[PDB]
Coordinates of C-alpha atoms and ligand atoms in Angstrom, one line a residue:
Chain A
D1 CA 84.3 104.3 92.3
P2 CA 81.1 102.3 92.3
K3 CA 78.8 105.3 91.8
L4 CA 79.1 104.8 88.0
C5 CA 77.9 101.3 88.7
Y6 CA 74.8 102.9 90.2
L7 CA 74.6 105.5 87.5
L8 CA 74.4 103.2 84.5
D9 CA 71.8 101.0 86.2
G10 CA 69.3 103.8 86.1
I11 CA 70.0 104.9 82.5
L12 CA 69.5 101.3 81.3
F13 CA 66.7 100.4 83.6
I14 CA 64.3 102.8 81.9
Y15 CA 65.7 101.9 78.5
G16 CA 64.1 98.5 78.9
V17 CA 60.8 100.1 80.0
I18 CA 60.5 102.0 76.8
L19 CA 61.7 99.1 74.6
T20 CA 59.3 96.5 76.0
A21 CA 56.3 98.8 75.5
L22 CA 57.2 99.4 71.8
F23 CA 57.0 95.6 71.3
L24 CA 53.2 95.7 71.6
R25 CA 52.5 98.7 69.4
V26 CA 54.0 96.9 66.4
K27 CA 52.5 93.5 67.4
Chain B
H1 CA 89.4 98.5 111.2
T2 CA 86.6 96.0 110.8
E3 CA 85.1 93.7 108.1
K4 CA 81.4 94.3 109.0
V5 CA 81.3 96.5 106.0
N6 CA 81.4 93.3 103.9
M7 CA 77.9 92.1 105.0
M8 CA 76.5 95.5 104.3
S9 CA 77.8 95.5 100.8
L10 CA 76.4 91.9 100.4
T11 CA 73.0 93.0 101.6
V12 CA 72.8 95.9 99.1
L13 CA 73.0 93.3 96.3
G14 CA 69.9 91.6 97.7
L15 CA 67.9 94.9 97.8
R16 CA 68.9 95.6 94.2
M17 CA 67.9 92.1 93.1
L18 CA 64.4 92.4 94.7
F19 CA 63.8 95.7 92.9
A20 CA 63.9 94.0 89.5
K21 CA 61.5 91.3 90.7
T22 CA 59.0 94.0 91.9
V23 CA 59.4 96.0 88.6
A24 CA 58.4 92.9 86.6
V25 CA 55.1 92.2 88.4
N26 CA 54.0 95.9 88.3
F27 CA 54.7 96.0 84.6
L28 CA 53.1 92.6 84.1
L29 CA 49.9 93.3 86.1
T30 CA 49.3 96.7 84.3
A31 CA 49.4 94.9 80.9
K32 CA 46.6 92.5 81.9
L33 CA 44.3 95.4 82.8
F34 CA 45.2 97.2 79.5
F35 CA 44.9 94.1 77.3
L36 CA 41.5 93.2 78.7
Chain C
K1 CA 98.0 107.9 104.2
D2 CA 95.7 105.0 105.0
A3 CA 92.7 107.2 105.9
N4 CA 90.9 106.2 102.7
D5 CA 90.7 102.4 103.2
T6 CA 87.4 101.0 104.4
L7 CA 85.9 104.1 106.0
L8 CA 85.2 105.8 102.7
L9 CA 83.5 102.6 101.5
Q10 CA 81.0 102.3 104.4
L11 CA 79.8 105.8 103.9
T12 CA 78.5 105.1 100.4
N13 CA 77.1 101.7 101.3
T14 CA 74.8 103.2 104.0
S15 CA 73.6 105.8 101.5
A16 CA 72.5 103.2 98.9
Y17 CA 70.9 100.9 101.5
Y18 CA 68.4 103.6 102.6
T19 CA 67.9 104.9 99.1
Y20 CA 67.0 101.5 97.6
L21 CA 64.7 100.7 100.6
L22 CA 62.6 103.7 99.7
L23 CA 62.2 102.6 96.1
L24 CA 61.1 99.2 97.3
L25 CA 58.3 100.9 99.4
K26 CA 57.1 102.7 96.3
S27 CA 56.4 99.4 94.6
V28 CA 54.1 98.2 97.3
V29 CA 51.8 101.2 97.0
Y30 CA 51.4 100.7 93.3
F31 CA 50.7 97.0 93.9
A32 CA 47.8 97.9 96.2
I33 CA 46.5 100.4 93.6
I34 CA 46.6 97.9 90.7
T35 CA 45.3 94.9 92.7
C36 CA 42.0 96.7 93.5
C37 CA 41.3 97.5 89.9
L38 CA 42.0 94.0 88.8
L39 CA 39.8 92.5 91.6
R40 CA 36.8 94.8 90.9
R41 CA 36.9 94.7 87.0
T42 CA 37.4 90.9 86.9
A43 CA 35.0 90.4 89.9
Chain D
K1 CA 94.0 104.2 144.4
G2 CA 92.4 107.2 146.0
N3 CA 88.9 105.6 145.6
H4 CA 89.0 105.5 141.8
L5 CA 89.5 101.8 141.5
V6 CA 87.7 100.5 138.3
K7 CA 89.6 100.8 135.0
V8 CA 89.0 100.0 131.3
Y9 CA 91.5 98.0 129.2
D10 CA 90.8 99.2 125.7
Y11 CA 92.7 99.0 122.3
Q12 CA 92.4 95.3 122.2
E13 CA 93.0 93.4 118.9
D14 CA 89.3 92.5 118.9
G15 CA 86.5 95.0 119.6
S16 CA 85.8 93.8 123.2
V17 CA 85.9 96.2 126.1
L18 CA 87.1 94.8 129.5
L19 CA 86.8 96.3 133.0
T20 CA 89.3 95.7 135.8
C21 CA 88.6 96.0 139.6
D22 CA 91.6 97.1 141.6
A23 CA 91.4 95.3 144.9
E24 CA 92.0 91.9 146.5
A25 CA 88.9 89.9 147.8
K26 CA 87.1 86.7 147.3
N27 CA 83.5 86.8 145.9
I28 CA 83.8 89.8 143.6
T29 CA 80.5 91.6 143.2
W30 CA 79.8 93.8 140.2
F31 CA 77.3 96.6 140.0
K32 CA 75.7 98.5 137.0
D33 CA 74.2 102.0 137.8
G34 CA 73.0 101.4 141.3
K35 CA 72.0 97.8 140.7
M36 CA 73.5 94.3 140.5
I37 CA 74.3 92.5 137.2
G38 CA 75.7 89.4 138.8
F39 CA 78.1 87.7 141.2
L40 CA 81.6 86.6 140.3
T41 CA 84.3 84.1 141.3
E42 CA 88.1 84.6 141.6
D43 CA 91.0 84.1 139.2
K44 CA 89.0 86.0 136.5
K45 CA 89.0 89.6 137.6
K46 CA 87.6 91.1 134.4
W47 CA 84.0 91.8 133.3
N48 CA 83.1 91.7 129.6
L49 CA 81.0 94.3 127.9
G50 CA 81.1 93.5 124.2
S51 CA 82.2 94.8 120.9
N52 CA 82.7 98.6 120.5
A53 CA 80.4 98.7 117.5
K54 CA 77.5 98.3 119.9
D55 CA 78.8 101.4 121.8
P56 CA 78.0 100.4 125.4
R57 CA 77.3 103.1 127.9
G58 CA 76.5 103.4 131.6
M59 CA 77.8 103.6 135.2
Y60 CA 79.6 100.6 136.7
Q61 CA 81.1 99.7 140.1
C62 CA 83.0 96.9 141.8
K63 CA 82.6 95.6 145.3
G64 CA 85.1 94.3 147.8
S65 CA 86.0 93.7 151.5
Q66 CA 85.9 97.5 151.9
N67 CA 82.9 99.7 151.4
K68 CA 81.2 100.9 148.2
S69 CA 83.7 101.9 145.4
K70 CA 83.3 104.8 143.0
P71 CA 81.5 104.6 139.7
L72 CA 82.9 105.1 136.2
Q73 CA 81.0 106.5 133.2
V74 CA 81.7 104.8 129.8
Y75 CA 80.7 106.7 126.6
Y76 CA 81.4 105.1 123.2
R77 CA 80.6 106.7 119.8
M78 CA 81.6 104.5 116.9
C79 CA 79.5 105.7 114.0
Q80 CA 78.6 102.6 111.9
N81 CA 75.6 104.6 110.7
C82 CA 77.3 107.7 109.2
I83 CA 75.7 109.3 106.2
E84 CA 77.5 111.9 104.1
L85 CA 75.7 115.2 103.2
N86 CA 78.3 116.7 100.8
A87 CA 75.9 118.2 98.2
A88 CA 76.7 115.3 95.9
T89 CA 74.8 112.5 97.5
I90 CA 71.7 114.6 98.0
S91 CA 71.9 115.4 94.3
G92 CA 71.8 111.7 93.6
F93 CA 69.0 111.2 96.1
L94 CA 66.7 113.9 94.6
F95 CA 67.4 112.7 91.0
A96 CA 66.4 109.1 91.8
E97 CA 63.3 110.3 93.7
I98 CA 62.0 112.6 91.0
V99 CA 62.5 110.1 88.2
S100 CA 60.6 107.3 90.0
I101 CA 57.6 109.5 90.7
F102 CA 57.5 110.8 87.1
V103 CA 57.6 107.2 85.7
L104 CA 54.7 106.1 88.0
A105 CA 52.7 109.1 86.9
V106 CA 52.7 108.0 83.2
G107 CA 51.3 104.6 84.2
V108 CA 48.4 106.1 86.2
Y109 CA 47.6 108.3 83.1
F110 CA 47.0 105.1 81.0
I111 CA 45.2 103.3 83.8
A112 CA 42.2 105.7 83.8
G113 CA 41.1 104.8 80.3
Chain E
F1 CA 112.8 70.9 120.4
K2 CA 111.0 74.2 120.0
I3 CA 111.6 75.9 116.6
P4 CA 110.9 79.6 117.2
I5 CA 108.7 81.2 114.5
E6 CA 109.8 84.8 114.3
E7 CA 106.8 86.8 113.4
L8 CA 107.9 90.1 111.7
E9 CA 105.8 93.3 111.7
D10 CA 103.7 92.1 108.7
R11 CA 105.5 88.8 107.9
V12 CA 106.1 85.2 109.1
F13 CA 109.6 83.8 109.4
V14 CA 111.0 80.4 110.5
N15 CA 114.3 80.1 112.4
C16 CA 116.4 76.9 112.7
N17 CA 119.9 75.7 112.2
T18 CA 120.0 72.5 110.1
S19 CA 118.7 72.5 106.5
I20 CA 115.0 72.2 106.1
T21 CA 113.4 69.0 104.7
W22 CA 110.4 70.4 102.8
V23 CA 107.2 68.4 103.1
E24 CA 104.3 70.4 101.8
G25 CA 102.5 73.7 102.3
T26 CA 103.6 77.2 101.3
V27 CA 106.9 77.3 99.5
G28 CA 107.9 80.8 100.8
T29 CA 110.7 83.1 99.8
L30 CA 114.3 82.4 100.9
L31 CA 116.4 85.2 102.3
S32 CA 120.2 85.5 102.3
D33 CA 120.5 82.8 105.0
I34 CA 119.8 79.0 104.8
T35 CA 117.1 77.8 107.3
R36 CA 115.7 81.4 107.7
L37 CA 112.6 81.3 105.5
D38 CA 109.9 83.9 104.8
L39 CA 106.3 82.7 104.6
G40 CA 104.6 85.8 103.3
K41 CA 102.3 88.3 104.8
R42 CA 100.0 87.6 107.7
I43 CA 97.0 88.5 105.5
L44 CA 97.5 85.5 103.2
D45 CA 97.4 83.0 106.1
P46 CA 100.5 80.8 105.5
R47 CA 100.1 77.1 106.2
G48 CA 102.1 73.9 105.8
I49 CA 104.6 71.6 107.5
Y50 CA 108.4 72.0 107.6
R51 CA 111.1 69.9 109.1
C52 CA 114.6 70.4 110.6
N53 CA 117.3 68.7 112.6
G54 CA 119.7 69.3 115.5
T55 CA 121.9 72.2 116.4
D56 CA 124.9 73.0 118.7
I57 CA 122.7 73.1 121.8
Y58 CA 120.9 69.9 121.0
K59 CA 122.4 67.1 118.8
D60 CA 120.5 64.9 116.4
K61 CA 116.9 65.5 117.6
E62 CA 114.3 65.5 114.9
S63 CA 111.4 68.1 115.0
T64 CA 108.3 69.0 113.1
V65 CA 106.7 72.5 112.7
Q66 CA 103.2 72.8 111.4
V67 CA 102.1 76.4 110.6
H68 CA 98.4 77.3 110.7
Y69 CA 97.3 80.9 110.3
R70 CA 93.7 82.0 110.2
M71 CA 93.7 85.8 110.2
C72 CA 90.5 86.1 108.2
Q73 CA 90.9 89.1 105.9
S74 CA 87.9 88.9 103.5
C75 CA 86.0 88.1 106.6
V76 CA 82.2 88.2 106.6
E77 CA 80.0 88.1 109.7
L78 CA 76.4 86.8 109.7
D79 CA 73.1 88.3 111.0
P80 CA 70.4 85.6 111.2
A81 CA 67.6 88.2 111.3
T82 CA 68.9 89.8 108.1
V83 CA 69.3 86.6 106.1
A84 CA 65.8 85.5 107.2
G85 CA 64.2 88.6 105.7
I86 CA 65.8 88.3 102.3
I87 CA 64.8 84.6 101.8
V88 CA 61.3 85.2 103.1
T89 CA 60.6 88.1 100.8
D90 CA 62.2 86.4 97.8
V91 CA 59.8 83.4 98.2
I92 CA 56.8 85.8 98.2
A93 CA 57.9 87.7 95.2
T94 CA 58.4 84.6 93.1
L95 CA 54.8 83.5 93.8
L96 CA 53.4 86.8 92.6
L97 CA 55.4 86.6 89.4
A98 CA 54.1 83.0 88.8
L99 CA 50.6 84.2 89.5
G100 CA 51.0 87.0 87.0
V101 CA 52.2 84.7 84.2
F102 CA 49.4 82.3 84.9
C103 CA 46.8 85.1 84.4
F104 CA 47.9 85.6 80.8
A105 CA 48.4 81.9 79.9
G106 CA 45.3 80.4 81.5
Chain F
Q1 CA 74.5 110.9 139.8
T2 CA 74.2 113.6 137.1
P3 CA 76.3 112.4 134.1
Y4 CA 78.2 114.4 131.6
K5 CA 76.2 115.6 128.5
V6 CA 78.2 115.4 125.2
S7 CA 77.1 117.2 122.0
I8 CA 79.0 116.2 118.9
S9 CA 78.2 117.7 115.4
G10 CA 80.7 117.3 112.6
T11 CA 84.1 117.6 114.1
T12 CA 83.3 119.8 117.0
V13 CA 82.7 118.0 120.3
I14 CA 81.2 119.8 123.3
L15 CA 80.8 118.2 126.7
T16 CA 79.1 119.6 129.8
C17 CA 80.4 119.7 133.4
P18 CA 77.1 120.7 135.2
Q19 CA 77.0 118.9 138.6
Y20 CA 79.9 120.7 140.5
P21 CA 80.2 124.1 138.9
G22 CA 80.3 127.6 140.4
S23 CA 83.8 128.9 140.8
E24 CA 86.0 127.9 137.8
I25 CA 85.8 124.1 137.4
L26 CA 89.2 122.9 135.9
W27 CA 89.6 120.0 133.5
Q28 CA 92.2 117.2 133.4
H29 CA 92.8 115.0 130.4
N30 CA 95.2 112.1 131.0
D31 CA 96.7 114.0 133.9
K32 CA 97.3 117.3 132.1
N33 CA 95.5 120.6 132.4
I34 CA 93.7 121.3 129.1
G35 CA 93.3 125.0 129.7
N36 CA 90.9 125.6 119.0
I37 CA 90.2 124.3 122.5
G38 CA 87.1 125.9 124.2
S39 CA 86.5 126.7 127.8
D40 CA 84.4 129.2 129.8
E41 CA 81.0 128.6 131.6
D42 CA 80.4 124.9 132.6
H43 CA 81.3 123.2 129.3
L44 CA 84.4 122.6 127.2
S45 CA 84.6 122.8 123.4
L46 CA 87.1 120.9 121.1
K47 CA 87.1 122.4 117.6
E48 CA 88.9 120.0 115.3
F49 CA 88.7 116.7 117.0
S50 CA 91.1 113.9 116.2
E51 CA 90.5 110.4 117.5
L52 CA 93.9 109.0 118.3
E53 CA 95.5 111.8 120.2
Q54 CA 92.3 113.1 121.9
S55 CA 90.6 110.5 124.0
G56 CA 90.8 109.1 127.5
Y57 CA 89.9 110.3 131.0
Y58 CA 88.4 113.6 132.1
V59 CA 87.6 115.3 135.4
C60 CA 86.0 118.6 136.6
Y61 CA 87.7 119.9 139.8
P62 CA 85.9 123.1 141.0
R63 CA 88.5 125.5 142.4
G64 CA 91.4 124.3 144.5
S65 CA 90.7 120.6 145.3
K66 CA 93.2 118.1 143.9
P67 CA 91.6 116.4 140.9
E68 CA 91.0 113.2 142.9
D69 CA 88.1 114.2 145.2
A70 CA 85.6 113.6 142.5
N71 CA 82.7 111.1 142.2
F72 CA 83.5 109.5 138.8
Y73 CA 85.7 109.6 135.8
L74 CA 84.6 109.8 132.1
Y75 CA 86.0 107.6 129.4
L76 CA 85.1 108.5 125.8
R77 CA 85.9 107.1 122.4
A78 CA 84.4 108.9 119.4
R79 CA 85.4 109.0 115.7
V80 CA 84.5 112.2 113.9
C81 CA 82.9 112.6 110.5
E82 CA 82.9 115.8 108.4
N83 CA 79.5 116.9 107.0
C84 CA 78.1 113.8 108.5
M85 CA 75.0 112.6 110.3
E86 CA 73.9 109.3 111.8
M87 CA 70.6 107.5 111.5
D88 CA 68.6 106.5 114.6
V89 CA 65.2 105.0 114.8
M90 CA 63.4 108.4 114.9
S91 CA 65.2 109.6 111.7
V92 CA 64.5 106.5 109.7
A93 CA 60.9 106.5 110.6
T94 CA 60.1 110.1 109.6
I95 CA 61.6 109.8 106.2
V96 CA 59.7 106.5 105.5
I97 CA 56.3 107.9 106.7
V98 CA 56.7 111.2 104.7
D99 CA 57.8 109.3 101.6
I100 CA 54.7 107.1 101.5
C101 CA 52.3 110.1 101.9
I102 CA 54.0 112.3 99.2
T103 CA 53.8 109.7 96.5
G104 CA 50.3 108.5 97.4
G105 CA 48.9 112.0 97.3
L106 CA 50.5 112.8 94.0
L107 CA 49.6 109.5 92.4
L108 CA 45.9 109.7 93.3
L109 CA 45.9 113.3 91.9
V110 CA 46.6 111.9 88.4
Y111 CA 43.9 109.3 88.6
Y112 CA 41.1 111.8 89.3
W113 CA 42.6 114.4 86.9
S114 CA 42.8 111.7 84.2
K115 CA 39.2 110.6 85.0
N116 CA 37.9 114.1 85.1
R117 CA 39.4 115.1 81.7
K118 CA 38.3 111.8 80.1
Chain G
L1 CA 87.1 93.2 102.2
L2 CA 86.0 91.0 99.3
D3 CA 85.9 93.2 96.2
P4 CA 83.9 96.4 95.6
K5 CA 83.3 95.6 91.9
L6 CA 80.7 92.9 92.4
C7 CA 77.8 95.3 91.7
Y8 CA 78.6 94.8 88.0
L9 CA 77.1 91.3 88.4
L10 CA 73.5 92.5 88.7
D11 CA 73.9 95.2 86.0
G12 CA 75.0 93.1 83.1
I13 CA 72.8 90.1 84.0
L14 CA 69.8 92.2 83.2
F15 CA 71.5 94.0 80.3
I16 CA 71.1 90.6 78.5
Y17 CA 67.4 91.3 78.5
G18 CA 67.8 94.8 76.9
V19 CA 69.8 93.4 74.0
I20 CA 67.2 90.6 73.3
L21 CA 64.3 93.0 73.2
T22 CA 66.2 95.1 70.6
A23 CA 66.4 92.0 68.3
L24 CA 62.7 91.1 68.6
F25 CA 61.5 94.7 68.0
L26 CA 63.8 95.0 64.9
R27 CA 62.7 91.5 63.7
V28 CA 59.0 92.4 63.4
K29 CA 59.1 96.1 62.3
Chain H
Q1 CA 103.9 62.8 108.5
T2 CA 100.2 63.2 109.3
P3 CA 99.4 66.9 109.9
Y4 CA 97.3 68.1 112.8
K5 CA 93.5 68.2 112.4
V6 CA 92.0 71.6 113.3
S7 CA 88.3 72.6 113.0
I8 CA 86.9 76.0 113.9
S9 CA 83.2 77.0 114.1
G10 CA 81.9 80.0 115.9
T11 CA 84.2 80.2 118.9
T12 CA 85.1 76.6 119.2
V13 CA 88.4 75.0 118.2
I14 CA 88.9 71.2 118.2
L15 CA 92.2 69.4 117.7
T16 CA 93.0 65.7 117.5
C17 CA 96.5 64.2 117.6
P18 CA 97.1 62.2 114.4
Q19 CA 100.4 60.7 115.5
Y20 CA 99.5 57.4 117.1
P21 CA 95.8 56.7 117.8
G22 CA 96.2 53.4 119.6
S23 CA 96.3 54.9 123.1
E24 CA 94.8 57.8 125.0
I25 CA 96.6 61.1 124.6
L26 CA 97.5 63.7 127.2
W27 CA 98.0 67.3 125.9
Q28 CA 100.6 69.9 127.0
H29 CA 100.4 73.5 125.7
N30 CA 103.6 75.7 125.9
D31 CA 105.1 73.4 128.6
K32 CA 102.0 73.2 130.8
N33 CA 99.7 70.2 131.5
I34 CA 96.1 70.7 130.3
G35 CA 93.2 68.3 129.6
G36 CA 91.7 65.8 132.0
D37 CA 92.0 68.1 135.0
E38 CA 88.2 67.7 135.6
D39 CA 87.7 71.5 136.1
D40 CA 87.1 74.5 134.0
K41 CA 85.0 72.5 131.5
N42 CA 85.7 75.1 128.8
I43 CA 88.6 72.8 128.0
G44 CA 87.7 69.1 128.1
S45 CA 89.6 65.9 127.5
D46 CA 88.1 63.5 125.0
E47 CA 89.1 59.9 124.0
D48 CA 91.0 61.3 121.0
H49 CA 90.2 65.0 120.9
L50 CA 90.4 68.3 122.8
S51 CA 87.9 71.1 122.8
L52 CA 88.6 74.7 123.5
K53 CA 85.5 76.7 124.2
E54 CA 85.7 80.5 124.0
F55 CA 89.0 80.6 122.1
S56 CA 91.2 83.5 123.0
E57 CA 93.9 84.7 120.5
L58 CA 96.4 86.4 122.8
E59 CA 96.7 83.6 125.3
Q60 CA 95.8 80.0 124.4
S61 CA 97.9 80.2 121.2
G62 CA 101.3 78.5 120.9
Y63 CA 103.1 75.2 120.7
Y64 CA 100.6 72.4 121.2
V65 CA 101.8 68.8 121.7
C66 CA 100.3 65.3 121.9
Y67 CA 101.7 62.2 123.6
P68 CA 100.4 58.9 125.0
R69 CA 100.6 58.5 128.8
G70 CA 103.0 55.9 129.9
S71 CA 105.6 57.1 127.4
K72 CA 107.8 59.8 128.8
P73 CA 106.2 63.2 128.2
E74 CA 108.2 65.3 125.7
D75 CA 109.6 62.5 123.5
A76 CA 106.9 63.5 121.0
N77 CA 108.3 65.3 117.9
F78 CA 105.1 67.0 116.7
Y79 CA 104.7 70.7 117.6
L80 CA 102.0 72.8 116.0
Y81 CA 102.1 76.6 116.0
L82 CA 98.8 78.3 115.2
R83 CA 97.4 81.8 115.4
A84 CA 93.7 82.4 114.7
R85 CA 91.2 85.1 114.9
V86 CA 87.9 83.6 116.0
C87 CA 84.6 85.5 116.1
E88 CA 81.0 84.5 116.5
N89 CA 79.0 84.0 113.2
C90 CA 82.2 84.8 111.2
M91 CA 82.9 83.2 107.8
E92 CA 85.2 83.4 104.8
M93 CA 83.8 84.5 101.5
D94 CA 85.1 85.2 98.0
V95 CA 83.9 86.2 94.5
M96 CA 83.0 82.7 93.3
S97 CA 80.6 81.7 96.1
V98 CA 78.4 84.9 95.8
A99 CA 78.1 84.5 92.0
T100 CA 77.0 80.8 92.4
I101 CA 74.1 81.8 94.6
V102 CA 73.1 84.6 92.2
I103 CA 73.0 82.3 89.2
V104 CA 71.2 79.6 91.1
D105 CA 68.5 82.1 92.2
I106 CA 67.6 83.0 88.6
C107 CA 67.6 79.3 87.6
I108 CA 64.9 78.4 90.2
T109 CA 62.9 81.5 89.3
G110 CA 63.3 81.1 85.5
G111 CA 62.4 77.4 85.7
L112 CA 59.3 78.0 87.7
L113 CA 57.9 80.7 85.4
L114 CA 58.4 78.5 82.3
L115 CA 56.9 75.5 83.9
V116 CA 53.6 77.2 84.7
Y117 CA 53.7 78.9 81.3
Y118 CA 53.7 75.6 79.5
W119 CA 51.6 73.6 82.0
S120 CA 48.7 76.1 81.8
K121 CA 48.6 75.5 78.0
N122 CA 47.2 72.0 78.5
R123 CA 43.7 73.7 78.4
Ligands
CLR1 C1 56.3 100.1 87.8 C2 56.3 100.9 86.5 C3 57.1 100.1 85.5 C4 54.9 101.1 86.0 C5 54.8 102.4 85.2 C6 55.7 102.5 84.0 C7 55.0 102.8 82.7 C8 55.9 103.8 81.9 C9 54.8 101.5 81.9 C10 54.8 100.3 82.9 C11 53.7 99.4 82.4 C12 53.5 99.8 80.9 C13 52.4 99.1 80.1 C14 52.6 97.6 79.9 C15 51.9 97.1 78.7 C16 51.2 97.8 77.9 C17 50.7 97.2 76.6 C18 50.3 98.3 75.6 O1 49.5 97.7 74.5 C19 49.4 99.3 76.3 C20 50.3 100.1 77.2 C21 50.9 99.2 78.3 C22 49.9 99.2 79.5 C23 52.3 99.8 78.8 C24 52.4 101.3 78.8 C25 53.6 101.8 79.6 C26 53.5 101.3 81.0 C27 52.3 101.8 81.7

């Protein structure tokens, strides 16, 4: 059942993309 | 019947590791152009 | 029965191998796009 | 043996495929599809092909004191490259494809200005 | 003095007559009989050294049985062309990352 | 020296006799007349293939000859796969080439649309 | 085989980054 | 007391009798004389060793013995029973070894980035 291990990689790969960008609006 | 699946599952990890390294440089290089 | 064992595993491993190779090719095309703008603008 | 005198010994513990020539003669000579692939000595009357995962194919023959023997066609299909199209993997393929192109499009939007 | 290892369907067994003098290796599981010893499944690769002594056929003759199984189960083959590609590309990608960091700092 | 042509798709395996044919061409699998299972014309069809009990030697004896006056025997070993396809060099190349073009064209569309609007 | 659940190694080893960037964003805002 | 020494690499198996090293040793396998026959160099006698090229599991696997020549043959009391699967470029791997390489890979990358980061600050 390693499709979940592929599923959550995607959902949290783009969560770092948005978070890192917001670091420079407020700095 | 075989164990040659093991190397294939080991090579998949290498491809996933390289993807993160390529994601970093693309993000990094776009910032320099924007923060000119 | 023992039909599940390793045969079910190798079908998904092949799928991911060619899926993740395609995403790696998409990064090279962006790198060529960005490296031209950087070279021209910074001379 | 009625002039069908080359056999295959399969179902080995390992993946090798071995061929046996059914005769009795010194200086055993082995063909492969109308051409030679090498000489042989005695006491070792088996010719080695390789693992079944490389699925060897072709026509083979064995020589002897008598005339030309009859060929045998070997056809192996061990997948080792199978991909499932069960409407669930193609769903995961399209989802990962559309998301990646959408993300790159946002970046090119900012690059222009 | 051959001591005939009886290999079961998926198991390893040792057959003798006189009581074993344990030395080292896999302890194993004893069955209902003395000197008939189970060494576990073939997949685990049992190893070790076990001793014995004479029988009715042969009297007072020491022996030594060393068991060595190498049925690789988590077995991994190697492809030199594949491992070369991963290392070569990893070296390149590290240099690009270092070049990018230098652009900001310098 | 015409070989047998084998067409496998899913779990149905079809192999072709053409070389001998013209009267009825019988078949013999492990010294038993095959007679689910397909026949007719110069090919044979196996509907729901199973690896372990269906494999071995085949021959195509035309009308009355004992199945020994042939020119060669066929040995096959194939494991089936349901809703299943295999990747060769041609298939891996076409998906790669198409993938590069479709993203490149779309990505360069945004650059000019962004530049035109701005 | 070795173990199918070794793909969890790559996942969490980059999840460390996601937690850290949540702290630095919350620290400044 | 001294156990047999066995080394496998690729399709090679090497054994050396540990019983008594003060004299040359002749080897018999399953009640058959081998080694020193000066033919079929796949197996070859060595001063204190024996090499088996192209190891085969089905044959070539049983009770191996060692004994010094001059002593009467089967007085030796050291019999080794081994059964091995040998394949080319095969290896044994586990969960710990793969994780060690993963962590080492980030260490060399992470160190290099921080080095150039601080080194470029000299100016
Ligand atoms: C390869 C992928 C990650 C590239 C495209 C992803 C998009 C969503 C990301 C990746 C790079 C990101 C940029 C990186 C840094 C900055 C600094 C900020 O002050 C301006 C926006 C900008 C420029 C970000 C906007 C969002 C951005 C363009």
